[PDB]
Amino acid sequence: PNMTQGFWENSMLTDPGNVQKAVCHPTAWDLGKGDFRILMCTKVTMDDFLTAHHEMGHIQYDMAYAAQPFLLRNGANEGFHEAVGEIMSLSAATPKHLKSI
Amino acid sequence: QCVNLITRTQSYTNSFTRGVYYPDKVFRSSVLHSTQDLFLPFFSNVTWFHAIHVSRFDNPVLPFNDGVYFASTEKSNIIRGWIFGTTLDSKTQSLLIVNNATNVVIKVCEFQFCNDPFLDVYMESEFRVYSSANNCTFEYVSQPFLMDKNLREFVFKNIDGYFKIYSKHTPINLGRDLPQGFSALEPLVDLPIGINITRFQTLLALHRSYLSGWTAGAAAYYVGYLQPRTFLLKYNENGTITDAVDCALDPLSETK
Amino acid sequence: CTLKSFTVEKGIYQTSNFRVQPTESIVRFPNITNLCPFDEVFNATRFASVYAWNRKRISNCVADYSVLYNFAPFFAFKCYGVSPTKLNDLCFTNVYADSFVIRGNEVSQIAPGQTGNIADYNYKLPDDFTGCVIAWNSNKLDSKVGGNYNYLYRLFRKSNLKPFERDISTEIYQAGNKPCNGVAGFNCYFPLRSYGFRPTYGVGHQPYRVVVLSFELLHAPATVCGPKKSTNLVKNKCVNFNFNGLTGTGVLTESNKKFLPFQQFGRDIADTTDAVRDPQTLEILDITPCSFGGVSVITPGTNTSNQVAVLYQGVNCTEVNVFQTRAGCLIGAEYVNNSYECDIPIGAGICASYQSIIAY
Amino acid sequence: YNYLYRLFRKSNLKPFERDISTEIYQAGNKPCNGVAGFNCYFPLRSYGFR
Ligand SMILES: *[C@@H]1O[C@H](CO)[C@@H](O[C@@H]2O[C@H](CO)[C@@H](O)[C@H](O)[C@H]2NC(C)=O)[C@H](O)[C@H]1NC(C)=O
Ligand SMILES: *[C@@H]1O[C@H](CO)[C@@H](O)[C@H](O)[C@H]1NC(C)=O
Numbered sequence: 001p002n003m004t005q006g007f008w009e010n011s012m013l014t015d016p017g018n019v020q021k022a023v024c025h026p027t028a029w030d031l032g033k034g035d036f037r038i039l040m041c042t043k044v045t046m047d048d049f050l051t052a053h054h055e056m057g058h059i060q061y062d063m064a065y066a067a068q069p070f071l072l073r074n075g076a077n078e079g080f081h082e083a084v085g086e087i088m089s090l091s092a093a094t095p096k097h098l099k100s101i
Numbered sequence: 102q103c104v105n106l107i108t109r110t111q112s113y114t115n116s117f118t119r120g121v122y123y124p125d126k127v128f129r130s131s132v133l134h135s136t137q138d139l140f141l142p143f144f145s146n147v148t149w150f151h152a153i154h155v156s157r158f159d160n161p162v163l164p165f166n167d168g169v170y171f172a173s174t175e176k177s178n179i180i181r182g183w184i185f186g187t188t189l190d191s192k193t194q195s196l197l198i199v200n201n202a203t204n205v206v207i208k209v210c211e212f213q214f215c216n217d218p219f220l221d222v223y224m225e226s227e228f229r230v231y232s233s234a235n236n237c238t239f240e241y242v243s244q245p246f247l248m249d250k251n252l253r254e255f256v257f258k259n260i261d262g263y264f265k266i267y268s269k270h271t272p273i274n275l276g277r278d279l280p281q282g283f284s285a286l287e288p289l290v291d292l293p294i295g296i297n298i299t300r301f302q303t304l305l306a307l308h309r310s311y312l313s314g315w316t317a318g319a320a321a322y323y324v325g326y327l328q329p330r331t332f333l334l335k336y337n338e339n340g341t342i343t344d345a346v347d348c349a350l351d352p353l354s355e356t357k
Numbered sequence: 358c359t360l361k362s363f364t365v366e367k368g369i370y371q372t373s374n375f376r377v378q379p380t381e382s383i384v385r386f387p388n389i390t391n392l393c394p395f396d397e398v399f400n401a402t403r404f405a406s407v408y409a410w411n412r413k414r415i416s417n418c419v420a421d422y423s424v425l426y427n428f429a430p431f432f433a434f435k436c437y438g439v440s441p442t443k444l445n446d447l448c449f450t451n452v453y454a455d456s457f458v459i460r461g462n463e464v465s466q467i468a469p470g471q472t473g474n475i476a477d478y479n480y481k482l483p484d485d486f487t488g489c490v491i492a493w494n495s496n497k498l499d500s501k502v503g504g505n506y507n508y509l510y511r512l513f514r515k516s517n518l519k520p521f522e523r524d525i526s527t528e529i530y531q532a533g534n535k536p537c538n539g540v541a542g543f544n545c546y547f548p549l550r551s552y553g554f555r556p557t558y559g560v561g562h563q564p565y566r567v568v569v570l571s572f573e574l575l576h577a578p579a580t581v582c583g584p585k586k587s588t589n590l591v592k593n594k595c596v597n598f599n600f601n602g603l604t605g606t607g608v609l610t611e612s613n614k615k616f617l618p619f620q621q622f623g624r625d626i627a628d629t630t631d632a633v634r635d636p637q638t639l640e641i642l643d644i645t646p647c648s649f650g651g652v653s654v655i656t657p658g659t660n661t662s663n664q665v666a667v668l669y670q671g672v673n674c675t676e677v678n679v680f681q682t683r684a685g686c687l688i689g690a691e692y693v694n695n696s697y698e699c700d701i702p703i704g705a706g707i708c709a710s711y712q713s714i715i716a717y
Numbered sequence: 718y719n720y721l722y723r724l725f726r727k728s729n730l731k732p733f734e735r736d737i738s739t740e741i742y743q744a745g746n747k748p749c750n751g752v753a754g755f756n757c758y759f760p761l762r763s764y765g766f767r
């Protein structure tokens with residue numbers, strides 16, 4: 001499934017400016033109650049594109065188990081959560097995908 | 102706050118040819134139309150009630166039968182409405198008709214009516230009419246039908262779900278209260294009530310004394326009962342019922 | 358064809374009936390007033406919690422289902438037992454409007470045969486529910502940045518709710534064996550929990566306002582009937598008239614009859630309608646039925662000639678070699694001022710003969 | 718769900734007439750233009766036989 005409207009409304013995908021300071025680390029946030037955000041200071045590079053795919057994979061993983069109870073809203077183990085983003089980082093980096101887009 | 106204040110005496114008089122109403126809303130001009138409906142019979146026994154409050158329970162609840170003819174020569178402020186129902190308590194639905202100086206409120210709820218209900222003016226309070234009103238299913242507020250020597254006639258019917266009220270105001274020259282001649286009662290309201298009505302009671306207004314809590318008063322009214330009867334009504338050039346014959350009164354009227 | 362013969366003897370034969378066909382349909386239904394208060398329920402500034410769901414009875418008005426259709430934000434307009442298309446014509450005795458606010462994920466639970474927290478403990482519909490459910494997003498009215506803590510729901514209850522039942526009790530839910538004694542803690546939880554609505558929630562959790570319309574019929578006459586369209590009035594023509602459920606076909610001419618204010622229709626000596634009052638504008642019209650006539654064919658013998666003349670009995674010549682007689686309109690015969698003996702009788706002193714066909 | 722019925726149609730059918738046309742119905746004032754959506758529903762619905 002595609003992204004929610006609140007994801008596009010509430011995520012800050014660009015560095016805000018000098019006046020407002022923010023953490024530049026790429027982080028995917030599952031705030032709860034169907035609210036999913038990405039904190040990313042995007043630069044126009046291939047690396048930020050792959051990192052955006054990784055964090056959107058994190059957000060999709062968080063999005064899929066929303067029907068589960070709150071204390072079970074995590075990966076089955078600690079490897080799965082990063083693995084499902086790293087497979088997107090693998091697939092997006094292929095020459096075929098770059099020729100496609 | 103139910104208090105017993107009204108005592109009532111009764112006499113018997115003659116209806117003459119009073120009580121005729123328009124049986125439908127169809128214009129008929131210069132014709133003789135025979136209709137079978139609930140009518141007050143000609144020269145029938147009508148009970149004249151005098152209700153007196155002086156400053157025990159002696160104001161019983163009257164039956165409704167198939168409909169009631171009501172008449173009064175009193176002013177518009179003394180008699181202020183009526184109560185209709187079967188048990189007159191919270192277990193069955195009931196209809197309350199209350200008139201005041203500005204409008205009339207007709208309202209069907211589950212009223213827990215008092216044994217001697219009366220509207221008291223002080224503003225007007227209905228706490229002496231009933232003690233509670235729950236599960237209320239109908240309300241209708243409209244222009245009043247007790248306005249201003251003047252004889253006021255009403256016909257109440259409860260037919261197949263609808264409560265029909267017919268009224269007329271006739272200026273009677275000083276004399277006998279029930280006059281001769283004809284004055285047909287125009288249809289006033291048809292209310293989609295759909296309740297069972299077997300008993301009724303008249304509402305009077307009492308004033309506070311401000312000095313035997315209520316001022317002494319008297320009210321005279323005539324009550325007759327409608328019966329399934331066939332009438333022959335005369336419609337004149339302008340559509341008004343100016344005359345009628347009661348088909349079962351005497352052999353001459355039967356021939357007519 | 359009428360005489361069932363190929364040879365017709367000289368004379369006048371009544372063969373058909375002329376009629377004036379109805380041209381338009383005029384459905385002057387009762388004037389549309391006192392529309393049902395759907396603005397009070399749908400456009401209320403404050404809705405109710407789902408545990409204390411608001412119920413409003415609707416009676417003695419005209420139920421307008423077009424305002425509902427006009428509103429765009431509706432997420433569900435799902436109807437049960439009656440079609441949405443035939444809402445305006447089929448009519449009922451009482452209409453119950455139940456209003457509450459829930460979360461988006463639970464909107465599927467407002468249906469017959471469904472299970473969940475809302476269906477079992479807050480609002481239950483029967484399996485034979487006849488009515489409609491309407492839901493729409495209410496972020497701009499019910500979401501607060503600090504959190505809207507004024508919407509509550511029942512999470513715990515001993516038994517499931519019956520259809521159309523409410524529970525406003527605040528008793529502590531006793532889930533174990535020990536008595537709660539009115540104080541919360543372990544195995545004793547308060548059943549009413551707050552719907553803390555915030556504008557940044559996901560679509561399954563945004564506040565949705567739900568109105569459930571339940572229609573019921575009883576032995577009483579049904580009085581919540583949807584408004585019937587009242588088309589324009591056309592006079593002086595043969596139009597099918599439907600005035601306040603009284604139907605017919607006839608010309609509606611101006612009337613000199615002064616009706617009394619309580620009268621609606623008018624009748625003849627022989628109890629046939631001759632007048633009516635328009636329910637939109639308080640005017641009196643003389644209903645006169647459209648012209649009809651006995652078509653008679655005047656012909657000599659087929660041995661002599663095949664020329665025919667047509668007499669429309671009782672019909673004026675302007676409503677159908679055209680001559681006007683007291684018998685009716687004669688078409689196909691030429692009036693001659695000469696007088697002869699009667700050959701084919703027409704009526705009122707008029708006779709027809711063949712010499713062409715002449716009338717005299 | 719193999720058995721379907723025509724819930725919505727513009728007009729009633731004739732005797733011994735079969736309608737198998739899977740075209741959309743316009744249930745409101747707004748035209749649907751052949752695409753499902755708000756107040757635009759498919760005429761043929763399946764029975765939930767259990
Ligand atoms: C006459 O009766 C009417 C009907 O109840 C009274 O009008 C109402 O007054 C109340 C005040 O408590 C208002 O809330 C309502 O809106 C009024 N209704 C209408 C239809 O106007 C009126 O006050 C009464 N007059 C007297 C002198 O008692
Ligand atoms: C997601 O896809 C659905 C249909 O697949 C569409 O209706 C919706 O608008 C899309 N959302 C966004 C944010 O593009």
Ligand SMILES: *[C@@H]1O[C@H](CO)[C@@H](O)[C@H](O)[C@H]1NC(C)=O
Nearest residue numbers: 112113114115144145146147
């Ligand atoms: C009216 O009824 C009373 C008793 O109910 C009776 O005594 C009286 O004679 C009656 N009057 C007439 C005119 O019948």
Ligand SMILES: *[C@@H]1O[C@H](CO)[C@@H](O)[C@H](O)[C@H]1NC(C)=O
Nearest residue numbers: 191192211234235236237238
């Ligand atoms: C009438 O009221 C009582 C309590 O006031 C209630 O228990 C009962 O169900 C009500 N009945 C109807 C028909 O509203």
Ligand SMILES: *[C@@H]1O[C@H](CO)[C@@H](O)[C@H](O)[C@H]1NC(C)=O
Nearest residue numbers: 186187188193296297298299
């Ligand atoms: C109306 O009430 C009376 C008295 O309570 C009763 O005898 C009668 O059967 C009732 N009518 C109906 C239709 O229930």
Ligand SMILES: *[C@@H]1O[C@H](CO)[C@@H](O)[C@H](O)[C@H]1NC(C)=O
Nearest residue numbers: 336337338339340341343615
């Ligand atoms: C009927 O109406 C006409 C015209 O308004 C009027 O002149 C006449 O007095 C009325 N009454 C009767 C009995 O004709």
Ligand SMILES: *[C@@H]1O[C@H](CO)[C@@H](O)[C@H](O)[C@H]1NC(C)=O
Nearest residue numbers: 395396399400424425427428
């Ligand atoms: C609510 O308000 C809107 C405002 O445009 C209006 O169009 C509508 O008729 C109102 N009522 C309902 C039931 O939506």
Ligand SMILES: *[C@@H]1O[C@H](CO)[C@@H](O)[C@H](O)[C@H]1NC(C)=O
Nearest residue numbers: 387388389390636637638639
């Ligand atoms: C009938 O409808 C018209 C429409 O303009 C309105 O003006 C009028 O008040 C309505 N009522 C009556 C009694 O004519």
